[PDB]
Ligand binder design. Structure first.
Ligand SMILES: *[C@@H]1O[C@H](CO[C@@H]2O[C@@H](C)[C@@H](O)[C@@H](O)[C@@H]2O)[C@@H](O[C@@H]2O[C@H](CO)[C@@H](O)[C@H](O)[C@H]2NC(C)=O)[C@H](O)[C@H]1NC(C)=O
Ligand SMILES: *[C@@H]1O[C@H](CO[C@@H]2O[C@@H](C)[C@@H](O)[C@@H](O)[C@@H]2O)[C@@H](O[C@@H]2O[C@H](CO)[C@@H](O)[C@H](O)[C@H]2NC(C)=O)[C@H](O)[C@H]1NC(C)=O
Ligand SMILES: *[C@@H]1O[C@H](CO[C@@H]2O[C@@H](C)[C@@H](O)[C@@H](O)[C@@H]2O)[C@@H](O[C@@H]2O[C@H](CO)[C@@H](O)[C@H](O)[C@H]2NC(C)=O)[C@H](O)[C@H]1NC(C)=O
Ligand SMILES: *[C@@H]1O[C@H](CO)[C@@H](O)[C@H](O)[C@H]1NC(C)=O
Ligand SMILES: *[P@](C)(=O)/N=C(\C)N(CC)CC
Ligand SMILES: *[P@](C)(=O)/N=C(\C)N(CC)CC
Lengths: 534, 529
């Protein structure tokens, strides 16, 4: 008849799951649990409404739809890009979450890891193969939760002050899922008092925004931020620029028959097919760029009462443990998406003129003086025109500006204001990587190791890569359990604003180093803001 | 002795025979080349010396031009060696000629030395500028002149005929004209004149390079630890007028240019000297009150602009710096510094020192300096902070202006040779933390180690002979090289220079290229926007 392990009652009703095989043994999975009412029709752009209770048994036996989003077509059929594309049908009916728990169900409350996917706030899905939670749960005996949240215009189009499209509803989707975890994770054996958020890129930025938003902060205990931070130059937008982008998108799809009554404008937007909005999404950006996304969280005083930078500097973070880090080559992946002279299919040995033009694309919407300051710091004036050095320098510009230095600033300020911080740099290039060698260890390619994907027998990772993945899963689960990645062996010291110690994650044992590109990040974090103001 | 009797255009001279370890030389010291700029002639351009009857006694140095006397460390060798060693006088426009003995009967290349001293001090009579060893060892003619310094040489009420400014530079030019007309009577070749100078003397050399009336008076140029494009070597017309006006007020004179200068001319020379430092707009190091003014006459534009717009084909220049250009100046005002301790400053003192070492810039500019010269992995290490502030002062005032001059001249047709002088003299009296300080290559260029009464090592005597050979080789041919390894020319791309030390030449790339990109390429854009 029924497997009692695969049957769970939550607040809304009864669920039926599936028993998953893993290389290490069985795991219980409840995939596609509805946590909100479908944000369709009149509910497009609105905050999520909690899922109404149901009679009978909901089959949570497969991943639900991917939230409607742009699909990348830069390199069709190429594994390096297709691995990030939707692997389920697109739909606005997409507010579902997933729970993995050990088989049999834990008998005592078990620490919970909650994953928030990245994707520049315009893409992503909890169903991607690289976010498969079965290996972590089996290997480390935690409960793992992941949720879908609205992206692009559907999640982050904002007419600030309006009731019809207030913005940040994609973040409210995440918060509702976190509230669902608090109310229901115990039914799966999870400990609601030991919830660790973790996420990568825009997912890491989301984690940070939940840290800085008091209504979210009560819903979790620890945080992990991989290759992303809320204080990046891409992760938030001001109210005026958000209104300008939303108004231009409406104009590009014929609404209204520009601006005017917000209620009328949104009502017209709600009549457009979802794909019509997606087709014009990228056109509302003020200039050609890399690492910039049209509809992102808006700083409007509500979800974020101030800029993440201000909230970080003004925050008391005693009692908080965070784990943060970057990959070795954060900037390289983004260059083939607009920087002149770049391609995955050649060595991208750019000229000096291409480097100077690339700086304006990688640092958009700054004064000519600011761009000259960037050129000053990233030119080797003994080799100003060397194509190989210019390629790596532009990668450093984009990676430092968008990822490394925002992460370093967050790590240093949190540590100085009471938090226990652990920092890493991920330095192993996967044997299965399909991107060219010049990209190094690109953005996003630590995730598969954190999730234990090398343990999948159908994949062809080396044996030592499987050992490496098991080590990383152990660090992450140790942190979730205790707030300390170290095993209760070379030790991982906390990051502090003074000593600035971090560890290198690679096939070799831990190596302790100092400074997350300290000289470069002093420019981005300490001087360049002063320049932009004067 | 007929070798010591010379007739120049103005009349007859009697010189003196001098001893060196390598043999005798002929010296003619204290030759008047201008009418004494006294009384009504104060602040005015020099007038050529009128002819005289009889024989001028040219056997001893003449008076030092009126100037401030350093009293930071009284009796200390390291400072006293720069102080006046003859009586001060406004009657000071004299020059000196050294020739081989017996006097050359064939035209000999001429070296003309212009002393430094921040345009406020200096004298051709200082022991460290003794030309006897260069003349004997390398068989050149050596000429050095006194020129007016301080307010007497560079007080300017721009537009006025009573105090036009730059008359100290005109003193140098008049001496250069005197060389053209008279050096052949000593055996010198007026068609082979090489200017060399250090610090403000090097800045002076560069200004003669950029002023067409001076360009026809010499052939090659050597610029040691100085350049005309520094932040200290020139002043704008408005600031010069403000400084001249403030000086008058400080000495009890009214604010009309004719009445102001007339009152200034009634004051004793020492009175002007006593108030010279107070007309500066703020407390600082490496800033001087009365310097050349850019008013469109001697300099038709800023030295920076003239260098960028110039065609320098047919020019050969020798330029260079010492290893630690900034250290000497730190004890003259940076908080926490002294020659008598290790000067291990704090972060707060470093930040205060930046405003002293980079005066009269915006707060944003100062923050940019702090950014580039902070090691953000060791932001508060006192030894690093000491070295960093020395780099700030040295790069801003000497190294990067020299690097900019070298690169632009080379890219625009000149043949440039660049050095870094890295030997600390065994006789140096300054503390070890100062390294190889500003000004302490001069004694080696002039062959002072050859003086047996001094305490230089045998190695240092050979080193000095090497340096004299490079300098004289350059004066003779425009190329310091002997027929080593070779000293390659400096170019804007390769940026090659040599290290001058006891060891053989080593070729290196970049005169603090990363730091000087900040000072030369970025910081001007920041200050203007
Ligand atoms: C902006 O317009 C809304 C909606 O107005 C309605 O839709 C318009 C296209 C048009 O058909 C109007 O006649 C409709 O009333 C206004 O909200 C409406 O306000 C009126 C007055 O209270 C009310 O009767 C409607 O029910 C309201 N509709 C909704 C959906 O809230 C709103 O007041 C207007 N604001 C302005 C013009 O500043
Ligand atoms: C490296 O590749 C870029 C990208 O060009 C594309 O990919 C190449 C592999 C090749 O298939 C091209 O035809 C593709 O268009 C080259 O930059 C492009 O150059 C072409 C013409 O030179 C120009 O029309 C495109 O706009 C350029 N694209 C970008 C993004 O700059 C680049 O020249 C290649 N480098 C080489 C060949 O050294
Ligand atoms: C290093 O010396 C400086 C200079 O102080 C002078 O020289 C010393 C050798 C000694 O003789 C002092 O008494 C002299 O005043 C020191 O900087 C001074 O510090 C005092 C306080 O102790 C302060 O009142 C002065 O203003 C400072 N002067 C300057 C120019 O900053 C410095 O503290 C010494 N460093 C040490 C001892 O580590
Ligand atoms: C691993 O290699 C095998 C053998 O060629 C192949 O069948 C399989 O598709 C590979 N796995 C992946 C994930 O590509
Ligand atoms: P962040 C900017 O969300 N990084 C995303 C775009 N990556 C996509 C390859 C990793 C999810
Ligand atoms: P420049 C600034 O003229 N060099 C001076 C300071 N030195 C004197 C101590 C060298 C003569």
């Amino acid at each position: 008849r029924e497997d009692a392990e695969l049957l769970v009652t939550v607040r809304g009703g009864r669920l039926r799951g599936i028993r998953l095989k893993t290389p290490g043994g069985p795991v219980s999975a409840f995939l596609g649990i509805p946590f909100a009412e479908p944000p369709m029709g009149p509910r497009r752009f609105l905050p999520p409404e909690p899922k109404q209770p149901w009679s009978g048994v909901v089959d949570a036996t497969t991943f639900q739809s991917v939230c409607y989003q742009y699909v990348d077509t830069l390199y069709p059929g190429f594994e390096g890009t297709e691995m990030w594309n939707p692997n389920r049908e697109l739909s606005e009916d997409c507010l579902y979450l997933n729970v993995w728990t050990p088989y049999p169900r834990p008998t005592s409350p078990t620490p919970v890891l909650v994953w928030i996917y990245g994707g520049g706030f315009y893409s992503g899905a909890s169903s991607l193969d690289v976010y498969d939670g079965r290996f972590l749960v089996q290997a480390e005996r935690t409960v793992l939760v992941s949720m879908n949240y609205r992206v692009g215009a559907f999640g982050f189009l904002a007419l600030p002050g309006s009731r019809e499209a207030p913005g940040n509803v994609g973040l409210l989707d995440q918060r509702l899922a976190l509230q669902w975890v608090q109310e229901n994770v115990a039914a799966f054996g999870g400990d609601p008092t030991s919830v660790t958020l973790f996420g990568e890129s825009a997912g890491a930025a989301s984690v940070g925004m939940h840290l800085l938003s008091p209504p979210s902060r009560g819903l979790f205990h620890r945080a992990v931020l991989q290759s992303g931070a809320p204080n990046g130059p891409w992760a938030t937008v001001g109210m005026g620029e958000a209104r300008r982008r939303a108004t231009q998108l409406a104009h590009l799809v014929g609404c209204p028959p520009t601006g005017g009554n917000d209620t009328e404008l949104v009502a017209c937007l709600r009549t457009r097919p979802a794909q019509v909005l997606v087709n014009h999404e990228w056109h509302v950006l003020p200039q050609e760029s890399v690492f910039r996304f049209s509809f992102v969280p808006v700083v409007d005083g509500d979800f974020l009462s101030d800029t993440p930078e201000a909230l970080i500097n003004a925050g008391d973070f005693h009692g908080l443990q965070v784990l943060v880090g970057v990959v070795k080559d954060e900037g390289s992946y983004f260059l083939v998406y607009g920087a002149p002279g770049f391609s995955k299919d050649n060595e991208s040995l750019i000229s000096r003129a291409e480097f100077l033009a690339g700086v304006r694309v990688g640092v958009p919407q700054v004064s000519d003086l600011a761009a000259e300051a960037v050129v000053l710091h990233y030119t080797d004036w003994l080799h100003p025109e060397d194509p190989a050095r210019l390629r790596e320098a532009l990668s450093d510009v984009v990676g430092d500006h968008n990822v490394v230095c925002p992460v370093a600033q967050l790590a240093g300020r949190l540590a100085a204001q009471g938090a226990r911080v652990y920092a890493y740099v991920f330095e192993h290039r996967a044997s299965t990587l399909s991107w060219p060698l010049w990209m190094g260890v690109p953005h996003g390619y630590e995730i598969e190791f954190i999730f234990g994907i090398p343990l999948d027998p159908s994949r062809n990772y080396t044996a030592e890569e499987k050992i490496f993945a098991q080590r990383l899963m152990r660090y992450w689960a140790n942190f979730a359990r205790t707030g300390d990645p170290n095993e209760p062996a070379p030790q991982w010291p906390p990051y502090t604003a003074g000593a600035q110690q971090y560890v290198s994650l690679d096939l070799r044992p831990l190596e302790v180093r100092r400074g997350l590109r300290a000289q470069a990040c002093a420019f981005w974090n300490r001087f360049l803001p002063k320049l932009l103001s004067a």
